[PDB]
Structures are given as structure tokens and as C-alpha cells.
């Protein structure tokens, strides 16, 4: 046999909807009452949603309603609410005590508003100073989508290096949580005058600077 | 719901058997004997490598074994192959519908050093509680897997409100970044003791703690 196919993407438009097919082969899928779909955002584990088909448990939201039409297993995701952008799964059983999944299905939801990130600069703990490190970070939180760029500034002529940007991740929220960091020796840092990200989210760049007189 | 519990790295050469356990996060055993191992490889089919605690379904080898012990239930890839590199999880049974998921696994084949985080915690600096609102920032840097267990604490307190996780990013060093921030209620920041940002890895179990003040 194979994996019960799924279609590797989907669409809904918050209000709008999204219903995704679980086609299988006679014995499987439409054979036995065992259709189930989970829920996988990015890790995490995946949470069942549906074990029989039709019926939603009540640590799932109700719009989550899934029915099996002869072969066409399906799960309408009702009146969409953007926070289940996630990659599912399907499954139902087959012989000797064996279940087999639908091969995901990618799903967004259109409409999302778009946000330009709040860039937090932290100058180093006195308790790292005291360690004899100097670690800059900035943290680039809640942008929509996860296009940003991230630049340091040691004042003008710019850090080319000990730069860490990351790759934007996940927040519980379609918005996403960067982080950049700069490894100095102290040695380098009151040598300074102010150092800087900046921060570039399409339409806009938003800087954050800070001089070795911070507090602590 | 929810309650197990399942180390973040694990790792082995070939030939290095690797055992993956999971632990029950409240009473289950006496009720649930009926636990399962998915295996899921990036961007593919999750397949339930055992069933009920030892059971091997069809097409799966046997350096792969299922067993338990009292509230952990565990598996071991006796004998690494390159192609055991993925994200494993485990899995449960309570009422009707309450299938519990384990937080999940990474499988790695060591080729590169081990390497433990770097935590670097930041706390809220005084310009941003200028800004009346406060952020403490932990910062994991310098590891090697890219999977790793992050959990905060405001005097003992394990507190899950406010934290936010990002995933690991290669850095240009080929090891590994991470970093959870926590948005506080800045008053909420003066009246408490202290702040723990915990890292979780192979064998590992780093604490970083930070006191307020109100500087300057």
C-alpha cells in the first residue's frame, strides 16, 4: 500500500472556510469507522482532533467537523480562525493492528493583518560583565508575515561580524519571534559609543540603539 | 490530556543504541497499558513504529523496541543507521476522547561534537521600564543538537503565561541558537524575588536566575 493521500495545501480566509480530502483505498479509509486527524504546528506533537470521523472532543474547538463520503475522507475547518494554521494529518486502519496516514496537508489562512515588530535591545547583565562576557541581543517579536531583516550598528561604520540573526518562529499567533545577537568583550563595549539594531519589516526599518552608561 | 513528558535531544553515532522514554505527568498506568511510538522524518509520514508499548507492526525492523517501566514508557533503536535521524513521539489513551501526545523527540546521528547551551539571560533594561513594560530575554547559544527543553519560573513558580519559544537556528559555527522571551506585567516584575530560565538538554539541566531592583 502507500500513505491514504492528502492534498499538500489548503486555504481558508478567516469567516471563510477550508475542507480537506483523505482519499483512500477501500480497505482502509470507508472499510472501517477509524478516521482520525491531527493537528502539527511546526513540532510540538500533533493533537487528535478526530477518532471517528464526525465527532470533535471538548478540548478541541467545535468547528472542526469531519465526515467520510465513500472513500473521500474529509474535514471541514468552519468559519476559520487563522490560529489553526498548522500541518495535519489523517489516518484509518488496515490489517494486522497497522494504521496509516494521509501524507499532510499544509494549511494557511488568508487575511491575517500584518504587523511590524516591537525591537527590544538588551544590553548585557552586570552578572555577565562580571563574567568577563559582553552579549548584545534584540528581540524582534511579533511581525507579520516573517519577513525581516536584522543589522548592526557599532555606531556608522557597521558590525560585519559575531552577528547571530535567527529565522523567524512560531508564536501562539500567526506573528513571529526573532532574535539577533553580537558577542563583544566589555573590552569593546565602553570602547563604543552605542550600538544598534536595526530592524527592516518590508515597509519599514526600526532601530533600537544603547550606550555602554546603561544600568546595570 | 496533554501530561507526558519526553526528553528533547537524543542522539547517537550508528552502531549507538539510543533509548527515548516518556513519562505519564499525572496518574494513567492501572488505567492506560496501550501506548504508541510515531516516528515522524522531517517534512513526512508520522508511522507508528510501535503499537501498544511493544508490539512491532509490520514493515518495522527490530532494533526497535517498545517496553515500560512504571510511568515511563520507552523505546531503543538498538543499532543506528543514518536514516533513524527524526522526531519521534509517544502516545496515550484515556476516555473515549483523550489521546495523549508526548512534547516529542529529535533523533540525531553525531556527526559533530556534542555542545551545551550557553544560557544568557537578560533582564528588563531601564529604558524599557521607562517605557513602563518589562522583558526578561534567555538566550541559548553554542549547542549542538538543535533540540532543547526551555521552562521559566518567578520564585519556584513554574510559570507558562508569557513565555514564547523559538526554534533552533543553525548559526554560521554549525551549532545551534534558541531563545524564549517573557513578557511581563512590570509591576509584577518589581514584586517578585527572583527569575529562572531553565535549558533542558541531553543530560544537561542548566538554571539561570535573575532579582530586580529599580535603578539609577
Known amino acids: 500500500p502507500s500513505a491514504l493521500t492528502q492534498p499538500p495545501s489548503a486555504s481558508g480566509s478567516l469567516g471563510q472556510s477550508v475542507t480537506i480530502s483523505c ?8 472499510g472501517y469507522n477509524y478516521v482520525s486527524w491531527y493537528q502539527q504546528h511546526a ?47 489523517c489516518s484509518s486502519y488496515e490489517g494486522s493492528d497497522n494504521f496509516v496516514f494521509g501524507t499532510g496537508t499544509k494549511v ?3 487575511g491575517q493583518p500584518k504587523a511590524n515588530p516591537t525591537v527590544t535591545l538588551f544590553p548585557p547583565s552586570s552578572e555577565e560583565l562580571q563574567a568577563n562576557k559582553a552579549t548584545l541581543v534584540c528581540l524582534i517579536s511579533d511581525f507579520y508575515p516573517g519577513a525581516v531583516t536584522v543589522a548592526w550598528k557599532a555606531d556608522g561604520s557597521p558590525v560585519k561580524a559575531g552577528v547571530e540573526t535567527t529565522k523567524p518562529s512560531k508564536q501562539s ?7 539577533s545577537y553580537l558577542s563583544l568583550t566589555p573590552e569593546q563595549w565602553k570602547s563604543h559609543r552605542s550600538y544598534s539594531c536595526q530592524v527592516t519589516h518590508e515597509g519599514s526599518t526600526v532601530e533600537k540603539t544603547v550606550a555602554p552608561t546603561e544600568c546595570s
Do not use: C, H, W
Request: charged share 20%; proline share 5%.
Open 23 to 30: 482519499t483512500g483505498t477501500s480497505s482502509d479509509v470507508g
Open 173 to 179: 499567533n500567526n506573528k513571529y519571534a526573532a532574535s
Open 43 to 89: 513540532g510540538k506533537a500533533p493533537k487528535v482532533i478526530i477518532y471517528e470521523v464526525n465527532k470533535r472532543p471538548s478540548g478541541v474547538p467545535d468547528r472542526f467537523s469531519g465526515s467520510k463520503s465513500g472513500n473521500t475522507a474529509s474535514l471541514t475547518v468552519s468559519g476559520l480562525q487563522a490560529e489553526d494554521e498548522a500541518d495535519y494529518y
Open 108 to 110: 494557511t489562512v488568508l
